[PDB]
Amino acid sequence: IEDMVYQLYTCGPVFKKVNNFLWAFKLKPPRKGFKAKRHAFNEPRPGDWGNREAHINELINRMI
Amino acid sequence: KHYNVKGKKKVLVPVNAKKTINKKYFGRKVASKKKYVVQRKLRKSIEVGKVAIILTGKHMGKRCIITKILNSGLLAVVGPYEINGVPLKRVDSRYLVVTSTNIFNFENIAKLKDDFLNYAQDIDDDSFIKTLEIKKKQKKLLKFMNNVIDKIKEIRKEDPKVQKLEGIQKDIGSLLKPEILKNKVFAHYLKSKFTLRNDMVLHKMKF
């Protein structure tokens, strides 16, 4: 599992195989909820969709 | 005996295995495959000299003195019968709110703390366990009410295992009688009953 973690975190030579071997993650709803799934994360109003960049980490943590 | 994964030292005591289940294909087996179980790990505020409040029994609301941790999670307690009328009773921890006052923080009782420990070192859970023979004798007479109650009392008194507890009670109470009685406000504190007034908020007040 540490090898899988390495190959996933660093897009190593065995990445397609590890990713395909891995079943799709079935996440919980966020602990504190979303802001608005309707709107973009980059919109000035509260929103969720789009590229969160490094901010995906806290959302994953609440969803995991 | 213990195990300390991740630095815990959980402490293991032997456990019997009596539940029996039928096997998948042919036989029967004992369900429990374990031989040790981790110990009780009672509360931090539970010490020998502390004074606690009983919450559930016929002595609910009464104040008592912790006596001994009884090797099985339950703890012996004596709200010294000579001052309070609370006998030597084995009580469960979670049915007992323990205060912050130690009987042995008093100058005139820290002296006899050692004798108290010596007297209390010889009580055990078997003494509190009710014997099958006396249970049968008590249930026999169920097949007028005043006579039934009196005979139940007599059988309990004549139980040989109750008598040793009564003797320990008597000697501990004799040891603790005059020192407790000479703290007049504390003596009344012990003889009093803890009640929840409508001005006290139990998520604010301290045990």
Partner: protein, 86 residues
């Protein structure tokens, strides 16, 4: 094989070490590194912090130049607006 309880691979130490054979060493190293006494860091905090003075100097300098550039742009725009006014 019969499915059993899925042990928590993060908090259950036995299965965690089963999955990651290096985890026991890594955690032990982290624990012993945490176990370091406070006196050493108390006596070394100033020694560590004093060496960062040059970094603080360049660190102030970069932000100073950035704010100078912002102010110069503001002044240029104000002058352009004044010129446009007449």
């Amino acid at each position: 094989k019969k499915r059993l309880q899925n042990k928590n691979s993060l908090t259950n130490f036995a299965v965690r070490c089963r999955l990651n054979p290096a985890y026991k060493l890594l955690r032990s190293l982290a624990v012993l590194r945490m176990r370091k006494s406070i006196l050493e860091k108390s006596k070394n905090k100033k020694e560590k912090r004093v060496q960062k003075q040059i970094q603080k100097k360049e660190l102030q300098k970069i932000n100073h130049d950035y704010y100078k550039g912002v102010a110069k742009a503001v002044k240029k725009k104000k002058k352009r607006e004044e010129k446009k006014a007449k």
